[PDB]
Amino acid sequence: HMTELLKNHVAGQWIAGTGAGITLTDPVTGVALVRVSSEGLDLARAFSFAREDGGAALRALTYAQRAARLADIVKLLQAKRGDYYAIATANSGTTRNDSAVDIDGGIFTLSYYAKLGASLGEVHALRDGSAESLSKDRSFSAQHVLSPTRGVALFINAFNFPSWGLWEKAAPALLSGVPVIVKPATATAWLTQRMVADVVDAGILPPGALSIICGSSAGLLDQIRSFDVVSFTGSADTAATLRAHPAFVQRGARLNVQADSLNSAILCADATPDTPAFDLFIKEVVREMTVKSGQKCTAIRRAFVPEAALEPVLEALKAKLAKITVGNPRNDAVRMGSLVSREQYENVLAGIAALREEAVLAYDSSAVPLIDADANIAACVAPHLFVVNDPDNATLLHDVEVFGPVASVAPYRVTTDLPEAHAVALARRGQGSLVASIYSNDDAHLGRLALELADSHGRVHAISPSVQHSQTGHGNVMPMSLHGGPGRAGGGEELGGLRALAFYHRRSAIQAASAAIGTLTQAT
């Protein structure tokens, strides 16, 4: 009578939604945590204030000045980490180590952009490439420039990364001088809203630079105009709804989508069980199934191995999966916590039942008692490993994503004369993915194989014994590398270091007297 109603931050003010709100709950214990509501907000005013007051204030600052503000946010969020870990344990049901992927991944990505940003200097627009002569006598030349878009950036983010989804987008947006309006997924919104409230309360950014709305999305796209940008992370079906809106179809606002992806792991023909690359493959597949209970868009969903390796691979995955204990993340003995909600628990079990129509269930620890959790309250699903003997004729293998601790292993036919050619073709049947990982003992071979996967995967991640200590993980997104993929993964691009700024800028060719191209360059 009652949990806290979290306020929205719109038009420079904290404003509660009306009504009873939507309750966020702990997915292990069932406790009611906080509520959200966007009912009754003045959305025209929220967008116009951000666009006008926020954008004008951010563009008045140089790139290096906005970078310095990002570095102050880093220090603030670092100081408040204990509060954020408590929210993540309760609202997301994740182990400490899994909560770190979201909290400390967010902070690390914001700090990387704060450091990249300081290098951009005390200017208000960036040069794109070098000057080029447009005349034999070099009297008339051209220089391309990037200028901040005079709009707002609206982020409609997914439930799995309330912190990193915010900061992976907000860091390049704010560095680019574009005000941010974040709309986190309701079930896990609390951490996003507490991080925004901490940053707003600190007065690091100007009024209007950072707004948040939690609750119903109704009305938001209707406020988007032609110079604004929208970044959506979520299901392919929802993305298709969004793409049809007049903001994009009529008004031409930029849209990035990152959607569902059936990411692959390919065990190379040389990586037989008596070689060190084989255990790296087994370990990475079990990690990606179990971190966050498989709720990473980049997790391994399909693992292709030589026919001759199939049984040794199943045996080694079963042995390693059996060490994953499941239950309340407050217990230090737990290796894997819950899904984000009981609704997701039901959705995952329905996905598992669907895949089982067409695959053999090779490992399922559902009957292992949970630790410190009631299976009728909590949203804990145990690891399930499927085997699909004939991946050429399988329907569901290459089409159906289960967003939980669930993956399928399938054999491929080694080519005797790349040995992994059939595995590349199978990977492609995922219709475009965020990431594939490839495992061999031969580094040079991995550089050649990577090129064959590049046109269908936004990232190719090569693990071999030489980098056992340094490879950064199949599903962990490093901010200097591109994040996105073609086709089913949404056709989007994020991060990639400075590449992420282009989405927030308009590019222009300036063609002028060569002296003027000089004075341009002194300002850029």
Next chain:
Amino acid sequence: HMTELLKNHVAGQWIAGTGAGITLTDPVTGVALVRVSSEGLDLARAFSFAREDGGAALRALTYAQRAARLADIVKLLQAKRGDYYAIATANSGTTRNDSAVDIDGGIFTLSYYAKLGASLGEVHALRDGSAESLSKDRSFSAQHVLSPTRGVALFINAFNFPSWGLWEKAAPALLSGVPVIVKPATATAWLTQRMVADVVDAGILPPGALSIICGSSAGLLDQIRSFDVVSFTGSADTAATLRAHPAFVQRGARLNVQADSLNSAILCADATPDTPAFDLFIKEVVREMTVKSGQKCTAIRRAFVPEAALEPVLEALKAKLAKITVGNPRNDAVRMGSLVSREQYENVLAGIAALREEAVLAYDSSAVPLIDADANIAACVAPHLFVVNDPDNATLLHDVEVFGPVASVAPYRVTTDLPEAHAVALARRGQGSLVASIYSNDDAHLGRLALELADSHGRVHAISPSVQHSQTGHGNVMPMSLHGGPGRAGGGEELGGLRALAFYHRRSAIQAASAAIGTLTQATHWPAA
């Protein structure tokens, strides 16, 4: 009975559409020229043959091998230019000099990419920037690459540039290893179809690399898949129709739009009538009104001048417009020919009456007899110059474009404290444009003002005395410079030299051991900065 029905080239074959087809006519003389039809074509196979055979054949070649094919196409088109000029005179009604903007503009842009493409090298993927370390010991790093998309490129092109609209798109697409399906605008499709026919008949590109469909567009987007790309040039209204299609909304295919634009020209406060930059402004406004009868998407539509300079600017534009003679381009005395069609003629004349409800008509040579043409047969419109004294409250100036030899002059209030601040605000009321041009005697001043226009204009073109003889023209699209603009101009990007390749490629981050990055590096290239 009857004129030639132009065939389509699809799935490696020349196929006629069925039915009587659509007649293309000479917009000066009314003669029936040729017909087109897409009726009955097997679009599934047109797209699958292009995507499978055309894509695989192009991807088997290196970038420099595809660039050498583009160079062979330049020599072929150069040898055939007399045929192309005869088709341009009859189908487009343009003077020889105006026809050159399409024909020789197209060939020049193709040759630019053939030369640039040779510097992409003997590889099948391009390097995007350089390695970045992901580890303290530098054992694990990331390298981005670009790979050709495993799709087709569908071009839906506008009526004004049958040649340049084909080659400005096809040069970077074929250099990128992506097969092309072009769909030119019907009214002026003949030149596009003859150029494609000459190139296909020469056997320079592999089968499937270059296809053409003329006639109805029905069914084309239904064949687009998620790795394909679509480049549309034409009206903003038609672009919004296309954006709603499942090819984009469900299947996520890339789309570029270039639409119309109310491009500005701004006379700076320093450029008073007694100075050299004033005359350069008057000349560039008249050239952009009159080349191709104003039918460039980049043409100046709104000219903003200081209040004090309004009357001298109107007087000088009137005197220079009065030298423009209108009529049959076959007559050497004609400086400006016709619009592309009698339909466009009626649209332009309705737009002129609409603007005139809110603007004064300062110049119009409509009463001058056409040279060697009948007003009731030719699609000729004389230049019309409007003046809008109050551009702040103007209801049409910043919103309604007439796609003909028509522009509006409006005064701005000079700021003294950028002197052109008001003009920049007014230019932004066009809601996003391909180009703005600026005119001053002071070259330093120009670099500053250009930055203020850059977030609303895809190109800012500064004309001043030191570049009187070298500046490349407000409306002329140089292929090394970006073409496109935000907002009303479509949100699209084309050309910009190497920048045009990204649209045809898929970018990937490869994260791997040092030795793996080295082997993948040996298989990539990017030209030296």
